């Protein structure tokens, strides 16, 4: 199940 | 509080009058909530994650209460798998990492 | 140490004796390293988050050192945009979120 919630701008 | 990381660091938030569960995420620049209605104007934006880029709606200056602490700032709404509280709001509530 | 969240929480890690920068990510269950040609047996896996899924290689019982603190466990390798330390290793070095 999805498990890597890295997030970058924009 | 002090939160260890054996399980996902989930907390209750209140936003636009409603309660939701969100993940405290030091790996996110921004706060991203699952599709929902929020009042006021928004702009289209794109953001990136592990799998690539998605389109979101950017709402500015939105009040949110996170595990009892008040924040007011930018909230992105879009097809994230889970509600995520990112650094933009983690800094408002005084969050640090410690080891 | 205490890491604040005004900036991406990038720290130095050591893997195979070699140094890399990685992001401390409380929003990741697992640890994923940018593509590198690590020796050893591996198994294919998919990891997911914002934007969908990517294909990675799963290595087991790999020693890592995170800001001088030793850890050992599962390390994924693939086309992540940045090296990410996830909870499987953050727990080993006694990392907490505090607010």
Swiss-Prot record, chain A:
Site (Cleavage): residue numbering on this chain: 5-6
Note from the entry: HIV-1 lineages are divided in three main groups, M (for Major), O (for Outlier), and N (for New, or Non-M, Non-O). The vast majority of strains found worldwide belong to the group M. Group O seems to be endemic to and largely confined to Cameroon and neighboring countries in West Central Africa, where these viruses represent a small minority of HIV-1 strains. The group N is represented by a limited number of isolates from Cameroonian persons. The group M is further subdivided in 9 clades or subtypes (A to D, F to H, J and K).
Residues of the full protein shown: 446 to 455 of 502
Source taxonomy: Viruses, Riboviria, Pararnavirae, Artverviricota, Revtraviricetes
Notes on the domains: Late-budding domains (L domains) are short sequence motifs essential for viral particle budding. They recruit proteins of the host ESCRT machinery (Endosomal Sorting Complex Required for Transport) or ESCRT-associated proteins. p6-gag contains two L domains: a PTAP/PSAP motif, which interacts with the UEV domain of TSG101 and a LYPX(n)L motif which interacts with PDCD6IP/AIP1.
Name the UniProt record assigns to this protein: Gag polyprotein
Organism: Human immunodeficiency virus type 1 group M subtype B (isolate ARV2/SF2) (HIV-1)
Similarity field: Belongs to the primate lentivirus group gag polyprotein family.
Modification after translation, per record: Gag-Pol polyprotein: Specific enzymatic cleavages by the viral protease yield mature proteins.
Highest taxon of the lineage: Viruses
From Swiss-Prot, chains B, C:
Peptidase A2 domain sequence ranges: 20-89
Coiled-coil region list: none
Signal peptide: none
Active-site residues, record numbering mapped to chain: 25 (for protease activity)
Region ranges (Dimerization of protease): 1-5, 49-55, 88-99
Segments crossing the lipid bilayer: none
Subunit relationships: Homodimer, whose active site consists of two apposed aspartic acid residues.
Protein purpose: Aspartyl protease that mediates proteolytic cleavages of Gag and Gag-Pol polyproteins during or shortly after the release of the virion from the plasma membrane. Cleavages take place as an ordered, step-wise cascade to yield mature proteins. This process is called maturation. Displays maximal activity during the budding process just prior to particle release from the cell. Also cleaves Nef and Vif, probably concomitantly with viral structural proteins on maturation of virus particles. Hydrolyzes host EIF4GI and PABP1 in order to shut off the capped cellular mRNA translation.
Name of the protein: Protease
């Amino acid at each position: 199940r999805p498990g890597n919630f890295f997030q970058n701008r924009p | 509080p002090q939160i260890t990381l054996w399980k996902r660091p989930l907390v209750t938030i209140r936003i636009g009058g409603q309660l939701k569960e969100a993940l405290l995420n030091t790996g996110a620049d921004d706060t991203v909530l699952e599709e929902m209605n929020l009042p006021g104007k928004w702009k289209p934006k794109m953001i990136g994650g592990i799998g690539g880029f998605i389109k979101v709606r950017q709402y500015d200056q939105i009040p949110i209460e996170i595990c009892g602490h008040k924040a007011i700032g930018t909230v992105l709404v879009g097809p994230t798998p889970v509600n995520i509280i990112g650094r933009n709001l983690l800094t408002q509530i005084g969050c640090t990492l410690n080891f």
